[PDB]
Every structure is written in C-alpha cells, then in structure tokens.
Write a protein that binds this DNA or RNA. Structure first.
Ligand SMILES: Nc1ncnc2c1ncn2[C@@H]1O[C@H](COP(=O)(O)OP(=O)(O)OP(=O)(O)O)[C@@H](O)[C@H]1O
Ligand SMILES: Nc1ncnc2c1ncn2[C@@H]1O[C@H](COP(=O)(O)OP(=O)(O)OP(=O)(O)O)[C@@H](O)[C@H]1O
Ligand SMILES: [Mn+2]
Lengths: 441, 437
RNA sequence: GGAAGUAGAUGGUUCAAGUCCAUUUACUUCCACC
RNA sequence: GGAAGUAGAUGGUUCAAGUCCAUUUACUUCCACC
C-alpha cells in the first residue's frame, strides 16, 4: 500500500482510545485533589502531560519540587513520604534516584522528588532536567503528538524503545525531540536513514553536525547527550529499519513480533547441523533491580566470551537471559574440542641465558628450533569450552560484576545440548544463531 | 675424561685406516693412467686431493679443463664422453651442471667438466671455483687437515653436514675454511657459541663482522656466500650444539644414533595422548634427483601448512618423507574438527549499497549487526583438516611444486589414524612431535 | 551498579611484563533507575 | 628445480579485497647437483 495509508492504519495501533484517556483524566483529578490537600509544589511532566503516550502504555509523572538547599537525604525522605501519602498502593525500588511507583484509580503513577532550579546548568539530583524538558516541549510539540506516538510505536514494536540498560534504545523524550527536529514520523524516518555513527543533532540550534559520536544535544542542557545510552548497534538497527520501511512500507513494522514455541528437537537438529558447541552458564538471579542486573550480565558475558577467545575455542556470539529466579549466560563456539598440546614461543637461539631458562622446565616433549627461535610443546588443563568456563568462572567469579560474580561464586553450573533446550532460553538461542522463521504476529 | 680426551677417541671414527687410503692411491694411479692416455687437461680437487675426507666415505674429485670457447653444450658433450670412457660402471643424473659419477678398482668417483678461467670472476660454468678453491686451500691446510676431520664427523653425526637441499648444512669446503680461519676444531667450537644470524666471517682478511645476514666469504670469490645454503635453523642447531659440547663434552656428539624404531603402537598412543589431528598426504614420488625434489617437498608442505592455518585448524608442525616410490607430506593439527558455521565480516551499517548486496546473498541464517557492522554465518565446505587438504590439494596441485604438483594432480591419498602408523614415516613423526621414547 | 579517564601499588602468567590474566588505593567524568 | 627481485597481464574469492587465494610474460640475480 501507499505509505500514507499504512500510517493511518498504524494510528489505530498507537493512539489511546477514550476508554483509557477517561481513566487518565480522572486519575489526574484525584492525584491533584490529594496533592493540593497536601499543599506541596508539584508539576505534571512526561508523556501524559504532553499527550504523547502510547495506547495501552499509560503512566502519569508527578514531580515534586523541593528547595535546592535540601540534602540528598531529605530529598529522599520527603519524596517517599508524599509519594506514599498520595497513592492507592505503591512500590519502592530504584537504582540511585529515589521515587515511588504506584497506582491511583487503577492507573500507574511515578511520583518523583527533585530540586526546583532557575537554571538546569549544574544539577543536584539526576532528574532535575525533567520539568525543564517539559517546559521546552510544552509549546513546541502541539499537534505533533501523533507523530510522536507513531515513532514510539515503530520503536517499541521493533524492540528499541527505552533508554534503560535492558533496552539501550530510544528514550520517550528522544522521540519527542526528533519529531520536533524533523517535523513528523515520516520525515524522521526518511532522514534517520542517513545518520552516520557521528551524526550530531543539535535540536535547539536546528543543526546537523559531525562529532566524535552520535549525540543529540539536549535543548535544556547542552552538555547532555539525550541518546547517551543508545547502543551503536541499536542505532544501526534503527537506520536499517528506516531504510527498509521506505523500500517496502508495511503495517508489520508497527506490530511486535513474538518468539515461536520451538521444539527442543528441531533445535537439536539445528545445532548439530551447525556443529557448534553451545552451552550456557546457569546461576541464581541476584535480587537487584533491572538497571543493575543487566550491565553486570553484559559484563559477565564479555569476560567469558573473551576468555573463550584467547583460549582458541573460537566463540561466535554470546547472549543472556534473566528469568524469575535464574540468569543464563549463553555462548556458541566453533571449536567443540581442542588438542591437549599447544605451542609456546621461546627465546631466539643466540640469547643463551634465556635458552638456558627455557629448557630448564620439565616437559613431556622436547623443545625444537624453527625460523631461528626456540619453541615448546605444553599441555592444556582443559580441552573443551565447557571445561574452560567451568574453570574460568570458578576462579574468576570476582571479575563478573559485583552481584552476579557473587551469585556465580555461591553456585553456577553449565548446561549444554538437549538438557539446555528444556530451559527458558530458546528464544535467545534462536536469536543468537540467526535461526530463520521463528518469530510471529 | 677431560676436554682433549674426547677428540682422541673420535679420531678412530674420522681418520681413514691403513686399508682405505691404500685403496685410494692405487685407484688414483689407475685414473691418471686412463686420463693421460686420453690426453686431457685435468686436475684433482676435493677432499681426496687435500687429504681431508672423512673415514669410510671417500670420493675422488677429478676436473676436466677446457678452453672458454666451448659452448654450453660442447663443454657437456666431451665432459660426459671422457667421463664414460674413464670410469668402470658409471651413472648420470644431475640437476644442472653435468658430471659423471662412477666406480674404479672399487671406490666412488666424480668427474666434472669445467672452464679454465684466469680468475673466478664472471664465472662461466657452475663449478668453476673448485680448482681455484684447491689452489688457495692446499698450502694453508697442510697439517691442520685433522681439524676438518674432527669437525666433519661432528657435523655428520648430527645430520647437519652437507650443503645439498636434503641437508641444508655445512659444506665440506666451508668446514675447511673454518679451520683456516680458526686453527682448531675446538677453537671453532668455542667461537661458534657467540655466532648470530647477523655474523659475517671474512676469511680473506680474517675479520668477524655484523653485516647483513650470515655470510662466510670465499677468499677465492669475495661475493660468494660459502654458507649460502645453511638454514637459519640448521645454523641454530650447530651453535646450540657447540654450547652443549663446551659445557658437557662427550663422544656421543660423534656417534650417529640410528633413528629409533618406535613401534606403530607406541606413537598411536602418544598421538592420541596429544589429542591432535595427525595425517599425511601420500603420493607417488616423481623420478627426479634429490636437489629438484626436496625444495619441491618443502614448498608443497609450506603451502598446505599455510592453508591449514588460514583455515583455522591450528597446525603445529609439518615434515615430509621420500621413499622408494612414495612421498609423504606430514602434518599435525590442534583442531580435529571445526564447526560447520563460521562468521563472514559485513560492511558498516552506514554503507547502504554494500549492505544491500551483502544481505542479498542467500544464506541459511539471518545476518546480524555487531559493533557497528553486519556479519553473516556461513557454512564451510569441509569440517576436518583431512577433508580440508583433500580439497586444497585437489584444486591447488599446481602451486605445490612443479613435479610434486603434477604427481598430486594424478593421485594422492590422505592417510591418518590406524593406517598411517604402519607406513615408513615414524622416524619423522617422532622428530616432528618432540618425542623422548 | 555499569562504563570512561588520571595518578598509583600489588599478585599471577611468561625465557622475558608499563604491554597478557587478575587485584587494589586515590581522583575527574558519564549512564541507567523519572 | 627452488628461492630472492624489477616491469606489467589476467582469473577466483569477497559487500568491497589493487591488501586474501591463485595464474601469467618479460628482464634480473641467487642456491642445490662438484
Ligand atoms: N533517559 C532519559 N533521558 C532524558 N530524559 C528522561 C530520561 N528518562 C526520563 N526522562 C524525563 O522524564 C520524563 C518522564 O519519563 P518516563 O520515563 O516517565 O517516560 P515518558 O517520557 O513519560 O514517555 P513514555 O511514558 O511514553 O515512555 C521524560 O519525558 C523526560 O523528561
Ligand atoms: N656447495 C659448494 N660450495 C663451494 N664449493 C663447493 C661446493 N660443493 C663442492 N665444492 C668444491 O668442490 C670440491 C669437491 O666437493 P665434494 O662435493 O666432492 O666434497 P668435498 O668438499 O671434497 O668433501 P668430502 O668429499 O669429504 O665430503 C670441494 O673441495 C669444494 O672446493
Ligand atoms: Mn511516563
């Protein structure tokens, strides 16, 4: 179909209906009656206050403005007090900046404490720009909300919406800025296509520039990269998505895909067809927030992956999963088994004193001469990748992030092959190996 | 036994006995008589003519002299004809410069044609320097001819004596030059220790030097490297050898130990203990002289070894063997079997046009992005180093040396596992695998 | 918590470490959690 | 026959390989067979 019609149909996927808006307005009225009764300085920020929220994804943001003089400790104490005071029921978990998550009249709320500033240049808390963002966006976003919703739909469906470490994709606010910078979803997509990894997009200045890295300049604070946590890979995924959408437009880009329930039998065959070593490390999930788990999970992966590569097991790709009570670290290797013996470089034949030291050692085989250098044969303490990481992880748990490294210490195991296939990691496995035709809807 | 007491014993193995020399002088008188009777300018050279041959292996060198006017061909025709005429039973097989190998009274003989030059500069024939070697070295070795004999046995018990491509070792002449430079086998051994690949020995002026690479100058032709064919590794073996002898001297350094008969069962265990892929390419041996063969076996093997590495089989070492009718290229590999899928590198996402082509190629698995750029899983054609070289040797036979290549082109088998060990390549596997029993 | 940078200092590995594998002190950043 | 080198001519691989795998024509050495 023509791109214009594909977008009209996409709007039914991304615009909240009056069921949900009603439910939000009267959630807003209640929240206000409560906060007013409490006589506190507050301000509605975020997608709800600018009507740029997606269908079925409503969350109201209430900011409480405290005096700049307040300590970090007082900011916490009162923040949570009011937040608790104001919600039908609540929940407190945060990685660094304190807030309370909760519900009023069946709708989700974040009540967040912050400092009231005259300038967002220099910032006490980490969220101090948010009420300035809104003030910047408030007038400039009007009548473009649906463009925003389209871009947020396109992103979510394609798994790259959100700046959190779990996603490392596009923040909601980044979406709003882009729509402001580019006019419309379509125009964002059409331009997105020629973003290099060095595209600097200075919204306030209306400029596109070449810099050291991809960088969206926060209108509100110039030092701030709005896309600071957008992975170079997700940037790439996005520009590819754009190029692909404009060749062949489709409502598909706006509907999300889901892993297909794949038989432990079919992927037995797939793995053996590939003939690779695939195994995971299974360990108990440290009870910490998402934004803390995921970097350490990434870290754990890199470290073993690198261990695997300097040990010549020739790793391909790595992935991870965090279930309810377990985390897995998945790997695939080209080498299932390596020989016991390997080569070690020795001193040049002339360097007498070091040659002395080099054959000093007790070795099963005699060292030889090659291209005018001594060389030895020595044994490996392991010959398969599973054996390797079993050893690596046992002795190097410390280096695997503070919390997983500790959970791995208390207990970890290796699962490989069919045993591993009855674990809730198949989706990653499929994804990791580039398995075709295993996603749907 | 002290230092000099080891050269004493060795003398019986290096100096020719009563019988051996006496069979020479008469086999020499017999030779002058036929050659004179033919009326040729000829002159005796080499180890026998300088009383510098090792006991047991004697070879008389006779040089036919000719005017410079003779064509490349003319030199060759008379050279062979006079040769055939002079010897008893005789043999011709050479790689470039025509000589004739034979037997007289019972001993082995070489008769080589060459041109009578004024000076060994712009040397016409290949071997023209030999008379001019003799003319300089005769009167400078008169009495120290037992210092070469000690050096020769030493190097020949170590299989690193002989400049020919099967040995890449020390030339007989070079050893003679090491005595005239140093004065004694022992002193030669002393300095050897601080020899480097950077060494330039100048016999002409008697001066050690750190020039280009290793270079023993010929005082007869300054531009010759008398050490031209000594390998870097074979150098390395001699200099380590001399370090070992100096610190712990033995007669064992003169005994030629006979390549261990390690049973086919024993190393099947060692190879399985090492857990490595160890196979050989077996093919019919081309009917060519050694000097054209061994360089081709070197090349053949080098090329396959380099294939192996670039194919991620992680080879350790290689070796080769020439038998009656067969040749063997041996390899050992860390990887017995590699996965079927591998990674091909794509282009950076920004490059729309190359990304589009890279994605258009039919594969079995979705390509992915990693660290900015596209990557693709691809299926290998072979999963074992054996399947590997079968495929390589099949297609690249021509790059594997002129003749060995032709031979591989006709036929070869890849032998490994149980079948390999019952073939005449065990000696070479031990050496290659660094075995001690 | 993660990442980055600066000035360190230890361990282990190697014939050989400022470089490889870990550890740790000090300091300046940044990101995520809104 | 092998190797080092100067001046080009292709062919395969690959998204791209003037850089990977090969091939080829000249002129230039050099080594082994003594
Ligand atoms: N990573 C971030 N970078 C910049 N601003 C942020 C970030 N996270 C939150 N904010 C600010 O806080 C506001 C509320 O953010 P929140 O995480 O509640 O999502 P949102 O912007 O409301 O959009 P949506 O609800 O559609 O995901 C944002 O509009 C923005 O001003
Ligand atoms: N590669 C070489 N380089 C220089 N000179 C050589 C070479 N090969 C042979 N010659 C010359 O030809 C002569 C005869 O060589 P031949 O191959 O018969 O052995 P040799 O040097 O006489 O010693 P032996 O016969 O004891 O091994 C030598 O004395 C030497 O002068
Ligand atoms: Mn929100």
């Amino acid at each position: 179909m023509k791109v214009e019609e594909i977008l009209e149909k996409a709007l039914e996927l991304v615009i909240p209906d009056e069921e949900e808006v009603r439910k939000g307005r009267e959630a807003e009225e209640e929240l206000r009656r409560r906060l007013d009764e409490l006589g506190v300085e507050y301000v509605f920020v975020g997608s709800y206050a600018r009507n740029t929220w997606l269908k079925g994804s409503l969350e109201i943001d209430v900011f409480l403005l405290f005096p700049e003089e307040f300590s970090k400790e007082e900011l916490r104490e009162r923040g949570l007090e009011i937040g608790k005071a104001v919600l039908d029921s609540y929940e407190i978990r945060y990685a660094e900046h304190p807030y309370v998550h909760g519900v009023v009249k069946g709708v989700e709320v974040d009540v967040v404490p912050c400092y009231k500033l005259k300038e967002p240049k220099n910032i006490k808390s980490a969220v101090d720009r948010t009420p300035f963002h809104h003030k910047w966006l408030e007038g400039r976003i009007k009548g473009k909300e649906n463009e925003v919703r389209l871009l947020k739909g396109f992103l979510k469906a394609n798994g790259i919406y959100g700046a959190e470490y779990k996603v490392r994709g596009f923040s909601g606010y980044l979406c709003e800025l882009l729509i402001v910078f580019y006019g419309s979803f379509l125009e964002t997509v059409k331009n997105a296509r020629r973003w290099t990894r060095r595209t600097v997009i200075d919204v306030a200045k209306g400029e596109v520039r070449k810099g050291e890295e991809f960088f969206v300049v926060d209108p509100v604070d110039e030092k701030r990269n709005v896309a600071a946590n957008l992975s170079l890979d997700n940037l790439a995924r996005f520009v590819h998505l754009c190029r692909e959408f404009m060749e062949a437009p489709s409502l598909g880009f706006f509907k999300p895909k889901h892993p297909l329930e794949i038989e432990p039998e079919r992927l037995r065959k797939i793995v053996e067809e590939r003939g690779t070593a695939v195994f995971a490390v299974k360990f108990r999930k440290p009870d910490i927030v998402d934004d803390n788990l995921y970097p350490q999970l990434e870290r754990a992966s890199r470290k073993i992956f690198e261990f695997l590569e300097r040990e010549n097991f020739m790793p391909l790709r790595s992935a991870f999963k965090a279930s309810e009570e377990f985390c897995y670290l998945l790997f695939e290797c080209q080498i299932k088994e390596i020989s016991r013996v390997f080569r070690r470089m020795g001193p040049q034949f002339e360097d007498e004193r070091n040659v002395k030291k080099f054959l000093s050692r007790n070795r099963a085989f005699r060292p030889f001469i090659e291209n005018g250098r001594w060389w030895a044969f020595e044994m490996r303490k392991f010959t398969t990748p599973e054996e390797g990481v079993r050893s690596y992880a046992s002795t190097h748990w410390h280096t695997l992030g503070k919390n997983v490294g500790e959970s791995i210490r208390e207990y970890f195991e290796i699962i490989s092959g069919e045993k591993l296939f009855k674990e809730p990691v198949t989706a990653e496995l499929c994804e990791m190996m580039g398995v075709k035709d295993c996603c749907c809807m």
